[PDB]
Amino acid sequence: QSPLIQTSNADYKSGKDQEKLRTSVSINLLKGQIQWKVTFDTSEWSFNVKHGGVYFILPNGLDLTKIVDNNQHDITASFPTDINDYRNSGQEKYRFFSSKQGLDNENGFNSQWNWSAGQANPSETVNSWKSGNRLSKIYFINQITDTTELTYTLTAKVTEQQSFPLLAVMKSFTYTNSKSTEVTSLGAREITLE
């Protein structure tokens, strides 16, 4: 695995929180299968006042088989498999987005990229992945109200390949930076299969 990438659109408007905000997302490889754990330092995000949301972003060649939340609850079956299932509406807590199923409109893969990682001032590398069409699934959880470190654990089967980008994104649905965009942070790592 590569070294950790972290970016955010957090700017001067957030005082001595700007850098804690930038570094809140981290990803660590754990183990024909890939397993990794995502940690969100929600400390300075004020989620308990007005909630946030998180995003898990998966590449081509990986298929989520298991996802466990910070309460060690297996929430895999909570996510839609059809993006147009009525259980996938904007109100719902667990949402799923897929490039195969659509790119544009509110539940479209590109729209959700734009509203998640796109907003986290992604470096050139993260943008290569999106632009090089190397990513295909987004898993989303609304209503994050925690104020501590949340850890999720994800397992996925390698369906195809050597390069495996893993991304995660957290943001506020209310607090914005100085250009009026939701404060949004990202962490990513490249896993290479030798």
Ligand X SMILES: OC[C@H]1O[C@H](O[C@@H]2[C@H](O)[C@@H](O)[C@H](O)O[C@@H]2CO)[C@H](O)[C@@H](O)[C@H]1O
Q: Contact positions toward ligand X, by CB under 6 A? A: 53, 90, 95, 106, 112, 115-116, 140, 142, 182
Backbone angles phi, psi at 139, to 5 degrees: -110, 130
Give the shortest CB-139-to-ligand X separation in angstroms. 11
Least distance from C-beta 16 to ligand X, angstroms?
Answer: 25
* Contact between residue 56 and residue 168 where contact means Cβ atoms under 8 Å apart: yes
Q: Distance of CA 25 to CAs 45, 77, 101, 161, 193, Å? A: 12, 24, 28, 26, 23
Rounded distance between C-alpha atoms, residue 185 and residue 87, angstroms? 26
Nearer to ligand X, 36 or 175 (CB): 175
Which residue type does 184 have? T
**What minimum distance in Å lies between the beta carbon of 140 and ligand X?**
5
Considering the complex, state which of residue 8 and residue 116 has its C-beta at the smaller distance from ligand X: 116
Nearer to ligand X, 112 or 153 (CB): 112
CB-wise, 2 or 78, nearer to ligand X?
78
Nearer to ligand X, 152 or 164 (CB): 152
Kindly tell me which of 94 and 164 has the beta carbon lying closer to ligand X. Answer: 94
| Residue 183 C-beta: closest distance to ligand X, Å | 11
CB of 30 to ligand X, least distance (A): 26
Q: 148 near 42, Cβ under 8 Å? A: yes
- Residue 147 sits at the vertex; the CA angle it makes with 174 and 14, to the nearest 5 degrees, is 50
Residue 73: CB minimum distance to ligand X, A: 20
User: Distance between terminal CA atoms of the chain?
Assistant: 10
> Do the Cβ atoms of 189 and 5 come closer than 8 Å?
yes
Q: Which residues of 31-56 are buried (b: 16+ CB within 10 A; e: fewer)?
A: eeebebbbbbbbebbbbeeebbbbbb
